[PDB]
């Protein structure tokens, strides 16, 4: 087991696999009952002495484009090279692996923007060892502010007790802030259903397919969250210390509920394409009815205007009581009988 | 034997007998020429082109002691690649894709490889192969192929084939990133057909490369005694390259599938637009056609003649009928 070999790359190099290369920041929280210390360091040396520190520490590394920092931390903290590759590898599915010394966790974040129904994916990775939590994230802006302010306020049992509660706090915050985005998407789809029932315009297909792809990505993310929480809860690895088995069982139930919700909502979404097809088919039927009636009334009338509009040397014109109004009345009668037939058949 | 190869034109046999000191090239067509070269202790390379000549490949196979089922599997051309393990020899079959410009199709060539002792054997459907780089390396005394055994040569052949897979993927990438904008911005009559051929090529590549990944994984994990232990990391590297290729193929297929389903969903709106155009134009120009046809009449007595400005008046009323028919629409936004 060692770094995978890539054709384009040189044999040993590790490459970032993302789009965000704008910002670099490190946040280190050494929180404890007696006191806590917070500080931001632009360099990687300051986090190294906390490898074997007894007090729990929480290192937030923002900006993984700097592969130098990540593999320096990995060499210093004993992280295996393949775990480093998967930390850099954003294009990934959430998963966890158990080692002799550390627990590696992969699970993604999603953000949503108004007026643009785009679902992002931020690769945030967690490393649990000794009493340290190592976090690698793509860009500034996180979902863990409530846990940070809870630590700063000293409220909650997470500050008093061990760091496995810190890992649980991070994971619970991530699963919780899935729900802000989920609520936003549910409101968006409800209002969108409102317009599609009101106005079935051209953009509806594009928006519905965008939402369908969004749901596909959410399913491809949520389904790996089980077999992750599954391993954490059932497998009870030694680093858990068995104190937090219900704090993993509840998240198991939460993830199962989310997976069931996405399974239901996929069919809910497909029904929207079904409804749109219904509406467009009905509109096409209306257009057919209008065109058919117009042609049906006005073609025999063109028969009259052509047959009697012929020019011939000996035509039986036979003017009877100035029969030109008589022919006009004949056309009127045939038009009336045709429109009556259409009304009876209920095309119009 | 049962034969299903497409081509019959060419047939040629090539043999490479090279050692750490000297190398020799031989060009011939007789079957018995390669028979003495099998006994050579140094690793040897056999290139046989033309599967339609069943008799010569047969005589070679029974000379080498190859089981007839392997021979008939080689005769089979339309099968998924798969690797066989036997005590006397290891059996491998692969694929050889070729891509072309100005016309977008996939051409696959069946190739099979059998490795026994210090002997390397393969059968080619036509002349020309992707294995030019390894031949050039051997001819000009480069690399470390000569120092190692024949299993390293088998490695070299496989990695040359995966290199040509990468070369194919680059052209596929160009085509997909041009069709992306072609579908999104400027649809055409044949854009749909281009998307279908692209998806066909991609699904064929996926169904071909998954067996290749399985074959390389089996070679790496099983580590058969015939292939030396020291050459297993190279096979693992080729397996990783195949993983790369598979991931690329899956991403490309997803992109093409999205390009398909968006367009396939827009077709109902397309139909509505076309028939709206037809209906509006027909319903505006049929009543006017009748008005002109019936007022342009050839009965003897015309009340139209007596009316002053009759022709301008009928033209004006025809225009206002056209106007009211136009404004009949836009109430449902038909126009």
């Amino acid at each position: 087991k060692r770094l995978s070999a890539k054709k384009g790359l040189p044999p040993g190099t590790l490459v970032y696999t993302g789009k965000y290369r704008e910002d670099f920041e490190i946040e280190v929280m050494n929180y404890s009952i007696e006191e806590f210390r917070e500080f931001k360091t632009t360099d990687v040396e300051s986090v190294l002495p906390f490898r074997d520190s007894s007090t729990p520490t929480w290192i937030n590394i923002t900006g993984i484009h700097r592969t130098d920092v990540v593999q320096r931390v990995g060499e210093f903290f004993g992280i295996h090279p393949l775990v480093l590759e998967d930390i850099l590898n954003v294009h990934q599915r959430p998963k966890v692996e158990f080692f002799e010394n550390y627990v590696f966790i992969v699970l993604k974040m999603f953000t949503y923007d108004k007026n643009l129904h785009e679902l992002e994916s931020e690769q945030v990775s967690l490393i649990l060892t000794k009493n340290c939590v190592l976090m690698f994230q793509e860009k500034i802006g996180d979902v863990f502010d409530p846990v940070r302010e809870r630590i700063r306020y000293n409220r909650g049992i997470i500050r008093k007790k061990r760091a496995d509660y810190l890992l649980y706090s991070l994971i619970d915050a991530l699963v919780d802030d899935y729900f802000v985005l989920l609520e936003k998407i549910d409101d968006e789809i409800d209002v969108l259903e409102e317009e599609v029932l009101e106005r079935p315009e051209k953009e509806t297909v594009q928006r519905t397919h965008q939402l369908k792809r969004n749901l596909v990505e959410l399913r491809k993310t949520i389904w790996p969250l089980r077999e992750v929480l599954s391993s954490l809860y059932r497998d009870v690895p030694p680093l858990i210390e068995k104190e937090t088995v219900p704090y993993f069982r509840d998240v198991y139930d939460h993830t199962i509920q989310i997976a069931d919700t996405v399974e239901t909502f996929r069919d809910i979404v497909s029904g929207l394409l079904d409804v749109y097809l219904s509406s467009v088919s009905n509109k096409t039927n209306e257009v057919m009815k209008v065109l058919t009636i117009i042609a049906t009334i006005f073609m025999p009338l063109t028969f009259i205007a052509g047959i009697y509009g012929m020019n011939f040397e000996y035509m039986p014109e036979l003017r009877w009581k100035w029969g030109y109004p008589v022919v006009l009345a004949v056309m009127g009668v045939i038009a009336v009988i045709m429109v009556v037939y259409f009304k009876k058949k209920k095309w119009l | 034997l049962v034969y299903t190869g497409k081509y019959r034109e060419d047939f040629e046999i090539e043999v490479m007998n090279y050692s750490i000191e000297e190398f020799r090239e031989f060009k011939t067509t007789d079957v018995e020429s390669v028979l003495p070269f099998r006994d050579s202790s140094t690793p040897t390379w056999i290139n046989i082109t033309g599967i339609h000549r069943t008799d010569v490949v047969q005589r070679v196979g029974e000379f080498f002691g190859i089981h007839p089922l392997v021979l008939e599997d080689i005769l089979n051309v339309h099968q998924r690649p798969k690797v066989e393990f036997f005590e006397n020899y290891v059996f491998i079959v692969l694929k050889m894709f070729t891509y072309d410009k100005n016309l977008h199709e996939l051409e696959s060539e069946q190739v099979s490889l059998i490795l026994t002792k210090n002997c390397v054997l393969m059968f080619q459907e036509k002349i020309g192969d992707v294995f030019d780089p390894v031949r050039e390396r051997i001819r000009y005394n480069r690399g470390i192929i000569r120092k190692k055994r024949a299993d390293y040569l088998l490695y070299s052949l496989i990695d040359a084939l995966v290199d040509d897979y990468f070369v194919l993927l680059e052209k596929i990438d160009d085509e997909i990133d041009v069709l992306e904008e072609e579908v999104l911005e400027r649809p055409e009559k044949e854009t749909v057909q281009r998307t279908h051929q692209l998806k066909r090529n991609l699904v064929e590549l996926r169904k071909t490369i998954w067996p290749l990944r399985e074959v390389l994984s089996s070679l790496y994990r099983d580590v058969p005694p015939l292939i030396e232990k020291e050459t297993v990391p190279y096979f693992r590297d080729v397996y990783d390259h195949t993983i790369q290729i598979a991931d690329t193929v899956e991403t490309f297929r997803d992109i093409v599938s999205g390009l398909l389903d968006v367009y396939l969903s827009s077709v109902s709106n397309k139909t509505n637009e076309v028939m709206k155009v037809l209906t509006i134009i027909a319903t505006i120009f049929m009543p006017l056609t009748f008005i002109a046809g019936i007022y342009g009449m050839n009965f003897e007595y015309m009340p139209e003649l007596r009316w002053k400005w009759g022709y301008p008046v009928v033209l004006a009323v025809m225009g206002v009928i056209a106007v009211i028919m136009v404004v009949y629409f836009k109430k449902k936004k038909w126009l």
Partner: antibody
Amino acid sequence: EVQLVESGGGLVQPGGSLRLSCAASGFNVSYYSIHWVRQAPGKGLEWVASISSSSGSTSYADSVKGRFTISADTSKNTAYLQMNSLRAEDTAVYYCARSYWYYIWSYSYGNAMDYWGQGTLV
Amino acid sequence: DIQMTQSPSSLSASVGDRVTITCRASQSVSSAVAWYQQKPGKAPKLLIYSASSLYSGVPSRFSGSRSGTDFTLTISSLQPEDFATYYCQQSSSSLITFGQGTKVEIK
């Protein structure tokens, strides 16, 4: 903070040899790739060599293949280009570059020279 | 050896005029195309990498795109700082080659 400095360039008699150098400050050579780009006066940039001290892999331009040797040492955090069998066509203003790989597809990667040197003329 | 042919050889425009610099690849380079600016007597600076991504710190007015093997570096509106030589670089292989260059000078 980051600075990439190259030195050792100067006047050379044609047919001779000249040993270039490159010193890196703020970043470690072991975690990146070091290139060399030369620009003859009034001409376009021409890539000549590339080195990765982590593995020692070397890439050489076919225009100048064999006339150049490139390597780096982790002790002094430096890289250098050694010149052999020089001629008139080798005259240019050589550059030291730092490049990082980026991901575009699972099969293909790319290179981008985001930090360069100040420039030395040979 | 993927030689890159860059057009136009020479061009001139005034401040505020949108321009485009097109690069052509003889062979297929997937998206490994980068753009640099070289002021007279200065080190080149990375602007666009992967043919579509702007390097950090570059003004957002610069933009590049890919059309198959057609790579175009377009400027929303030239500035006094933007009258220089721009280069097209392919990074598909270990052997990496530059373009000829487009020289921009004030009208």
